[PDB]
Write a protein that binds this DNA or RNA. Structure first.
Ligand SMILES: [K+]
Ligand SMILES: [K+]
Ligand SMILES: [Mg+2]
Ligand SMILES: [Mg+2]
Ligand SMILES: [Mg+2]
Ligand SMILES: [Mg+2]
Ligand SMILES: [Mg+2]
Ligand SMILES: [Mg+2]
Ligand SMILES: [Mg+2]
Ligand SMILES: [Mg+2]
Ligand SMILES: [Mg+2]
Ligand SMILES: [Mg+2]
Ligand SMILES: [Mg+2]
Ligand SMILES: [Mg+2]
Ligand SMILES: [Mg+2]
Ligand SMILES: [Mg+2]
Ligand SMILES: [Mg+2]
Ligand SMILES: [Mg+2]
Ligand SMILES: [Mg+2]
Ligand SMILES: [Mg+2]
Lengths: 283, 290, 60, 128, 98, 95
RNA sequence: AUAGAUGAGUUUGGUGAUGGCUCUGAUUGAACACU
RNA sequence: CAAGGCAAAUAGGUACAGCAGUGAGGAAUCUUGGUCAAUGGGCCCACGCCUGAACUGGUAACUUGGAGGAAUGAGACGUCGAUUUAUCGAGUAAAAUUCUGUAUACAUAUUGAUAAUGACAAUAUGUACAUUUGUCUUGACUAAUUACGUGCCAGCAGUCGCGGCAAUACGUAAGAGACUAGUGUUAAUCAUCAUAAAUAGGUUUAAAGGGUACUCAGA
């Protein structure tokens, strides 16, 4: 015979918790329910954690077509739909893999995809856009900027963000240079000068587009300069890759993090606690 | 070998919260107490209580010794800064007055005034507090097995580890058989389609298929682990939620680890069914493990 | 340039991060390497880098 | 003290504190074997009353110390090779050592069910 | 007798060689005069490469090695071969055609 | 957190409270933790310099939270601004 | 390298001090007992 | 060259703090293996020879890292433990079903190496297998309880302490708390300890101002 605790479980699970057996309605059906900001709360005791929306299937395609077909800069697509550049780049990567599967006649998880998408809040982009997907201007809280500093200055001094950065540290930059899309500030400065919106977007596209070229150029030169130091000597079986480097850059006392060689005077640390012996990155 | 710590995983008497979609766990989570009484208990008794509650869910399959070192006292956070304010103002007004800012009248004088005073100039929503307390178990979200459980690919953390150990996941297009691989920003872990369907799929009852062989759309297949036609687990809708630091693709069962879980001013990106009072106590425990 | 970068690797789309956006704390590396020698003196132009110096100490 | 008085060596090490088990602390040894010289009963002091089962042991080093026999009933007598570990009978002056019960000649309690590790008692093996 | 040779470092079944400039009659792994480069015997495979090719990673300071070779440094058989591939010296052994 | 640093003495019991940055937690003793957790503080680093009397410890640390330096009084006293760099940098007060 | 600084039990009829002892944390080229 | 130990006799060798190993001492620490294939060294015109360094196999939970199984499981309408025979628990626990093929085993291939030489093993792929619990604690410090037995006895104890006939502290039984192929204890070290205080202490009544101040050195 079922115990009372078990009996109460099925009692709650039959009437109050029955609404969670099958997902009939579209959208989140969590326990916490709608909050103050219209976001479902998965755990009632924790109000801060919320079920944030996920880009709908049709939304991912729109982002993909814009970057690939129209060749628009990633920064512009991010600023347009208020999607983080790191997320826009991921959607493209994931979408490319889909094209491979479809190109290789692989079966997709359509039954699983449709079922899971009905349990998560979505944000269809385009015409019917109510709110931005996420914040594209989040700036990392640097450790230096977290300190409590009250600097004594003149009574009539114009303390600016530039002066605040120098008070926190000497090498610190203001929050105007830490943004992932710094062109927005320049775009917003045009609206303060009563510049037509049409021309304001034109300058924005050119600015972002020009910025991507510089990034690509730097990346191109880097990779081209890294392959100039490698000498590939094909042999009967393998291909030897002789990389060059300055053997004199071992610091002033031999101890340097970016040196090349097995260090002398170190016993094998295999016996130390919490010794990482797993791959740290997959290239 | 089932250890003595797993003897009572979903017990209704103890009422623990575990990282799984089991119906027994759902009942415990739903009917969990609103606030455990911690007034009479001492500081150690409060910390020990919080440790047990939080450790029953966060990294339950991780030895206490290992997590003690994994616990980091570095709680990351971000701050939203709109470009509109950046253009107009340069932060000089935030120092006007005596350094802290131009004072404003009290709240009891404003109500009497017919016309409200001009709003203070600052970023939008620049007074809400950021929940640092609810970030203690952030390092556990970097585990390859926990990240799979948060992408709704496995039914629990235990099952998510099985897929990794049995060579079913591939990080950045390469087989990864280590459930402790700490994902890096940009990595792309992809689970096998079949293992995801079985985990999230409904149980395959041989009795329900007995009357199915005689009597878009997917045909019934009696030679597959999950029940055909595939349908979500019985109680998967109560735990269906994806964090903001992941960009999953249901179709190919792949996701990208965009960044590390971060606390914003108003929310947190660490799934935790515990109030800040408990996490705050747990955080104090691991400062000196006492 | 051996093979094109596939969409799986994170280098398929390069998105440079903003300055001072991470605080990774590197661990102290134990051990040292021997300091190579300073062949030339610190002042003046040595005789080893003159017009002909290898034809004077290694004549054919 | 002034900076001059510190150059002259005014900061000397604190006076050493006597250890609990000097015989072991001196040579940094966790235990020592000794031949039992006498098996007797020592009496507690002011608060406590009873009869402790001590034993005069001659360690390998040469020192003759008075150990303590934890448990109910022992199996050692004159000229018994026993293993001595650190410890102290708080209420017994002169007793600053214990004796391992699963030791060479000292046998663990046979009727012990709880905390067998402390008394060197193998598992009963009721079914096995 | 200055010698360009390999100092074996690594764990069991995980050889990792370190190119050094040391006197002949000295311990193999003793602190040398200079560390020209490193050598990895086990061939690797490009991450995203399914053709099946293999390569060996060698970080060598050609400029520094050349100077020592010009003053009478005697590279060993193993190191001589590596220098030959780069083109500094002529091969010490060649496959017979007949 | 509190403003700056405070040091209050109550008959041989001295308590030193420091203001720590956000996300530091209440890395304080058990008695101070109950007071900080109750008053609304979330980041603090205390210390008992001389004595650890349970009662005076509570009296001294309670008297220290009422003796915080007022940045606005110090400004009017010196005729100089005391600008919080954290607020100017982030264009507001990040709570 | 900017997060890193923490206590507890015990002297007195009682209170506040002084001052030791012990526990709380981490560890070993360790030994022993039960496994 | 001298002395003693072993050996030696008319001789005049030997000292394993070279590798493995034996005895002894001790709380306590290993195989009398294979190969010069790799790296290094000595001799050599060259080939080549030698290498107890070295590379490899073996023994030990000594340490670290990893594996050591996930999901479903409600009416076997049973069993057990208590006891308010109907309340409180063992209990989703078990059985059962549905999947996986981890350590490992076997098989193939590649690789450690090339002018040529592979002692031994690593890695990849394929197939196949679901394999133990142990231990401490339970008055406060310090997370976690009752019953019985014993009666300042037997015993527990890191500190304060407990036990003198209704003991939450001893010994059994059950439960509970916790770590886990480890768990405890003993020894030692750092920290705790501003507890020799340079950073950074103190000396009327608590440990501690010299009996005194003229004064060389010295601050
Ligand atoms: K007392
Ligand atoms: K005197
Ligand atoms: Mg005493
Ligand atoms: Mg028991
Ligand atoms: Mg004191
Ligand atoms: Mg008195
Ligand atoms: Mg000898
Ligand atoms: Mg030997
Ligand atoms: Mg012996
Ligand atoms: Mg050789
Ligand atoms: Mg050779
Ligand atoms: Mg030759
Ligand atoms: Mg296998
Ligand atoms: Mg050979
Ligand atoms: Mg308690
Ligand atoms: Mg006991
Ligand atoms: Mg008892
Ligand atoms: Mg282990
Ligand atoms: Mg006097
Ligand atoms: Mg005198």
């Amino acid at each position: 015979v079922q115990s009372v605790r078990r009996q109460k479980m099925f009692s709650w699970l039959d009437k109050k918790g029955s609404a969670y057996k099958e997902h009939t309605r579209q959208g989140p059906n969590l326990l916490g329910g709608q909050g103050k900001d219209g976001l479902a709360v998965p755990f009632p005791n924790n109000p801060y954690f919320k079920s944030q929306p996920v880009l709908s299937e049709g939304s991912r395609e729109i982002i993909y077509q814009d970057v690939m077909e129209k060749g628009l800069p990633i920064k512009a697509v991010s600023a347009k739909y208020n999607v983080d550049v790191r997320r826009v780049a991921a959607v493209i990567r994931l979408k490319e893999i889909e094209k491979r599967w479809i190109k290789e006649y692989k079966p997709l998880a359509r039954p699983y995809a449709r079922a899971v998408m009905k349990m998560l809040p979505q944000t269809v982009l385009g015409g019917p856009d109510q709110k931005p997907h996420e914040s594209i201007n989040d700036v990392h809280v640097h450790s230096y900027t977290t300190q409590q500093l009250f600097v004594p200055v003149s009574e009539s001094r114009e303390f600016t963000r530039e002066d605040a950065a120098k008070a926190f540290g000497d090498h610190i930059l203001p929050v105007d240079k830490k943004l992932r899309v710094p062109e927005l500030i320049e775009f917003q400065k045009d609206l303060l000068k009563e510049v037509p919106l049409q021309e304001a977007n034109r300058k924005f596209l050119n600015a972002t587009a020009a910025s991507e070229a510089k990034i690509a150029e730097r990346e191109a030169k880097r990779r081209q300069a890294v392959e100039d130091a490698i000498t590939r000597v094909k042999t009967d079986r393998f291909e030897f890759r002789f990389q060059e480097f300055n053997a004199e850059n071992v610091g002033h006392d031999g101890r340097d993090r970016n040196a090349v060689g097995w260090r002398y005077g170190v016993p094998f640390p295999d016996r130390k606690r919490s010794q990482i012996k797993i791959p740290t990155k997959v290239e | 070998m089932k250890i003595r710590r797993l003897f009572k995983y979903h017990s209704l008497k103890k009422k623990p919260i575990r990282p799984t979609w089991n119906k027994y766990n759902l009942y415990n989570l739903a009917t969990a107490g609103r606030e455990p009484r911690i007034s009479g208990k001492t500081f150690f008794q409060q910390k020990w209580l919080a440790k047990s509650l939080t450790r029953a869910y966060h990294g339950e399959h991780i030895k206490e010794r290992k997590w003690a070192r994994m616990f980091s006292r570095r709680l990351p956070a971000v701050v939203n800064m709109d470009p509109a304010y950046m253009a107009k103002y340069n932060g000089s007004e935030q120092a006007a007055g005596r350094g802290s800012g131009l004072s404003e009248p009290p709240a009891y004088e404003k109500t009497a005034d017919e016309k409200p005073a001009k709003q203070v100039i600052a970023n939008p929503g620049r007074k809400v507090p950021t929940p640092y307390e609810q970030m203690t178990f952030a390092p556990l979200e970097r585990r390859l097995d926990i990240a799979i459980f948060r992408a709704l690919f496995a039914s629990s953390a235990r099952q998510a580890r099985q897929m990794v150990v049995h060579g079913a996941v591939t990080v950045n297009g390469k087989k990864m058989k280590h459930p402790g691989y700490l994902l890096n920003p940009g990595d792309l872990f992809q689970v096998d389609v079949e293992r995801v369907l079985y985990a999230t799929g409904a149980p395959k009852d041989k009795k329900l298929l007995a009357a199915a062989m005689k009597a878009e759309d997917n045909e019934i297949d009696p030679s597959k682990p999950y029940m055909t036609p595939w349908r979500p687990r019985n109680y998967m809708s109560a735990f269906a939620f994806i964090p903001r630091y992941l960009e999953v693709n249901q179709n190919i069962c792949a996701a990208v680890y965009l960044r590390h879980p971060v606390a914003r001013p108003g929310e947190s990106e660490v799934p935790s069914p515990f109030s800040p009072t408990i996490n705050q106590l747990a955080f104090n425990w691991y400062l000196r493990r006492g | 340039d051996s093979v094109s970068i596939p969409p799986d690797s994170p280098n398929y789309i390069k998105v440079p991060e903003p300055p001072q956006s991470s605080e990774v704390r590197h661990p102290f590396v134990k051990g040292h390497l021997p300091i190579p020698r300073s062949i030339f003196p610190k002042k003046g132009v040595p005789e080893k880098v003159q017009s002909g110096y290898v034809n004077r100490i290694a004549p054919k | 003290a002034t900076l001059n008085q510190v150059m002259r060596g005014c900061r000397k090490p604190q006076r050493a504190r006597h250890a609990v088990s000097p015989a072991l602390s001196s040579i940094k040894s966790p235990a020592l074997k000794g031949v039992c010289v006498k098996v007797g009963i020592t009496r507690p002091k002011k608060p406590n009353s009873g009869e402790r089962k001590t034993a005069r042991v001659r360690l390998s080093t040469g020192k003759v110390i008075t150990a303590y026999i934890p448990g109910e009933g022992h199996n050692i007598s004159q000229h018994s090779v026993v293993l001595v570990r650190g410890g102290r009978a708080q209420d017994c002056p002169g007793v600053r050592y214990h004796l391992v019960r699963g030791a060479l000649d000292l046998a663990g309690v046979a009727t012990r069910m709880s905390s067998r590790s402390k008394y060197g008692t193998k598992k009963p093996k009721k079914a096995s | 007798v200055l010698k360009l040779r390999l100092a074996r470092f690594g764990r069991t079944n995980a050889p990792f060689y370190n190119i050094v400039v040391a006197h002949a009659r000295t311990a193999r792994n003793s602190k040398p005069l200079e560390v020209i480069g490193t050598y990895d015997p086990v061939p690797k495979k490009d991450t995203y490469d399914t053709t099946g090719k293999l390569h060996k990673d060698i970080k060598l300071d050609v400029t520094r090695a050349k100077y020592w070779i010009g003053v009478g440094a005697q590279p060993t058989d193993t190191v001589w071969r590596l220098l030959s591939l780069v083109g500094i010296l002529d091969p010490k052994y060649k496959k017979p055609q007949p | 957190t509190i403003y700056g640093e405070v040091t209050t003495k109550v008959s041989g019991t001295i308590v030193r409270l420091n203001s720590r940055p956000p996300g530091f937690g209440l890395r304080v003793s058990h008695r101070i933790f109950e007071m900080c957790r109750a008053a609304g503080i979330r980041d603090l680093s205390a210390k008992f310099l001389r004595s650890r009397n349970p009662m005076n410890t509570v009296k001294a640390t309670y008297q220290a939270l009422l003796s915080q330096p007022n940045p606005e009084d110090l400004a009017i006293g010196r005729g100089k601004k005391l600008v919080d760099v954290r607020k100017v940098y982030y264009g507001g007060s990040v709570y």
